[PDB]
Amino acid sequence: MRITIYTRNDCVQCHATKRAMENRGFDFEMINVDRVPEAAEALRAQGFRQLPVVIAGDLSWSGFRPDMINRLHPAP
């Protein structure tokens, strides 16, 4: 399952999210929305209003959400 974190530099909630995923041994890709406006536009069209935005399988959320990150633990 691919986990993508849409991020921005100087974004505390983004850093917290990355660190939280690393603390749990998750593999993820990061996409800087300032360097990739196509992604920024796509996220705005889906209604997101804050960063980071995490997309993983059927889940998609914004902001630092430890509770949602915990839903990414691998199945047996």
UniProtKB/Swiss-Prot annotation:
One of its GO terms (biological process) is cell redox homeostasis. The keyword Disulfide bond applies. The keyword Transport applies. Pfam families: Glutaredoxin (PF00462). Residues 1-76 form the Glutaredoxin domain. GO terms for molecular function: electron transfer activity. Keywords: Disulfide bond, Electron transport, Redox-active center, Transport. Disulfide bonds join 11-14. InterPro entries: GlrX_NrdH (IPR011909), Glutaredoxin (IPR002109), Grx-like_ET (IPR051548), Thioredoxin-like_sf (IPR036249). CDD domains: NrdH (cd02976). SUPFAM superfamilies: Thioredoxin-like. PANTHER family: GLUTAREDOXIN, GLUTAREDOXIN-LIKE PROTEIN NRDH. Belongs to the glutaredoxin family. Electron transport system for the ribonucleotide reductase system NrdEF. This is Glutaredoxin-like protein NrdH. It comes from Escherichia coli O157:H7. The lineage of its organism: Bacteria, Pseudomonadati, Pseudomonadota, Gammaproteobacteria, Enterobacterales.
